[PDB]
Structure formats: C-alpha cells, structure tokens
C-alpha cells in the first residue's frame, strides 16, 4: 500500500561508447575484394603524356563516403585490370605500373616505364580475358592484362584518411607520407585524334579503422 521514496541529491550517468562501434557504426571495417571503375585509357598527342592515379579510398565512389566515417585505412589489395574495347586494327600498346615514392619522377618512355613496380603492357586490343576477373576474386589468367600493387609493404602501416588533394607547394617527401603509391598509365603510340581504346577497372580491398565524425574528417 505504501512505497518508500529516497531521491538522490542529483541524477546523472556515465557514457563510454565502444562495443566495437561508436554512434551506430563499427570502429573497424573490411571491404573484402570489391570491383569498381577506375577510369578510361585516354590516348592523346603528346609522348610525355601519361595518366596518374593516386592510391586512395577517394578513388572509390560509393565506398568513399563510407570511408569518411573512419580515421585510418590500409590497402590490402589494389589491382588494376585493363579491358579493351576497340577494333583489332587499333595500333599501339598500353603500359601500366606503380610508383612507390612520391618523389620519383613519372616515366616518359617505354624503357623507363618498364622499370616501374608491377609493370605490365599489351597491345591495346589485348586483354579480353580480363573481363571474367571482374566482380569475382579469381586470379589473373588468360591474356588478362593486370597490374597489382604489392600491398605487403603496408601490412604494418595505417594511413590517415585524407580527403583533399596534394598541393603543388607541398614537398614531395611530405606527400609521400600519406600516399601509399601512384598508379601510372602510358601510351607508347602518340595519336592524331584523342581516343579511348579501353578501360581501367579496379579490384581492391581496404581496411578502415577508428571512429571519427565525417564532417571533421579531412
């Protein structure tokens, strides 16, 4: 019939987030092997001309915004597959490779390109078998034209997710501290009219770690 009442002087609580998730999102995430579009193989008129792609989660369109909720990341696999889409009457070849030091210069000829990491080359209409590698975890085979970054060098490193692009004024040595590597694509055949004989697809896998507010993530 009667219940006692003994209010405290004040009321409060102590919150410590961290099951293994903060604010409803895991503090650790593995994408697993995924496939996404990197870019097209653009051929132009200059010989020096080459395309450079910085290894970064920013290169993943959908995965990008997800990564924004994490502070650190690590490349577990980063392989580019070339898929030809042109007549077999198309002359010229394609050369791809990785640069592991942001300070190193970008190759301007075949002799030099051939020395890049995981270098690979092929006639522009070759590599048709590569299309089977997409969306699967299969391993390169057939005339598949691929180039994979040896991610074993990053197995102990944790990069901080950076969303802005490196400036000009930035010392290469500094840029090198947060850019795992650069992927380079070159044409050995300068053309009269610009064209796009094939495409570059990315088979990757990355780890995301550390909770952080997306808006404060820079």
- Tell the smallest beta-carbon distance from residue 162 to a copy of itself (Å): 7
- Of these, 54, 119, 205, 207, which contacts a copy of itself (CB under 8 A)? 119
Determine if residue 60 is left, alpha or beta; phi over 0 gives left, psi from -120 to 50 gives alpha, anything else beta: beta
CB 52 within 8 A of CB 106: yes
Distances (CA, A) of 56 to 73, 89, 181: 9, 35, 9
* 19 belongs to the binding site for a copy of itself (CB under 8 A): yes
Nearest to 160 by CA among 174, 177, 181: 177
Name the β-bridge partners of 37.
201
What is the token pair recorded at 1? Answer: 């019939």
- Tell the smallest beta-carbon distance from residue 29 to a copy of itself (Å): 14
- Tell the smallest beta-carbon distance from residue 129 to a copy of itself (Å): 7
- Of these, 91, 101, 153, 170, which contacts Ca ion (CB under 5 A)? 101
Determine if residue 174 is left, alpha or beta; phi over 0 gives left, psi from -120 to 50 gives alpha, anything else beta: alpha
* 211 belongs to the binding site for Ca ion (CB under 5 A): no
* 217 belongs to the binding site for Ca ion (CB under 5 A): yes
> 179 to 218, contacts with a copy of itself by CB under 8 A?
188-189, 192-193, 195-197, 199, 209-218
* 175 belongs to the binding site for a copy of itself (CB under 8 A): yes
Nearest to 182 by CA among 158, 199, 166: 166
* 47 belongs to the binding site for a copy of itself (CB under 8 A): no
Considering CB under 8 A, how many residues would be counted as binding a copy of itself?
121
Stretch (H or E) spanning 124: none
- Tell the smallest beta-carbon distance from residue 74 to Ca ion (Å): 14
* 30 belongs to the binding site for Ca ion (CB under 5 A): no
> What's the distance, CA 77 to chain centroid?
9
**Interaction partner, residue 112 (Ca ion, a copy of itself, none; CB < 5-8 Å by kind):** a copy of itself
d(CA 180, CA 153): 9
> 77 to 96, contacts with a copy of itself by CB under 8 A?
85-89, 91-93
**Span near Ca ion by CB under 5 A; candidates 2-10, 25-33, 154-162, 180-188:** 154-162
């Amino acid at each position: 019939v009667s219940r006692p009442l003994n209010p405290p002087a004040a009321v409060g609580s102590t919150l410590k987030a961290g099951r293994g998730r903060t604010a409803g999102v895991s503090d650790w995430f593995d994408t697993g092997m995924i496939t996404s579009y990197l870019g097209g193989f653009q051929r132009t008129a200059g010989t020096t001309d080459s395309q450079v792609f910085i290894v970064s989660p920013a290169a993943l369109d959908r995965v990008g915004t997800i990564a924004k909720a994490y502070a650190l990341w690590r490349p577990k696999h980063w392989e580019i597959v070339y898929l030809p889409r042109c007549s077999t009457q198309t002359d010229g070849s394609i050369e791809m490779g990785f640069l592991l030091d942001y300070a190193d210069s970008v190759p301007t000829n075949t002799r030099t390109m051939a020395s890049s990491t995981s270098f690979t080359t092929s006639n522009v209409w070759g590599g048709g078998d590569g299309s089977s590698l997409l969306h699967t975890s299969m391993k390169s085979m057939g005339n598949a034209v691929t180039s994979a970054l040896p991610c074993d060098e990053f197995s102990n490193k944790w990069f901080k997710l950076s969303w802005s692009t490196p400036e000009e004024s930035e010392n290469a040595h500094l840029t090198d501290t947060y850019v795992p590597a650069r992927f380079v694509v070159r044409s050995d055949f300068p053309v009269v009219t610009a064209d796009q004989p094939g495409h570059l697809w990315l088979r990757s896998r990355i780890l995301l770690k550390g909770s952080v507010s997306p808006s404060t993530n820079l």
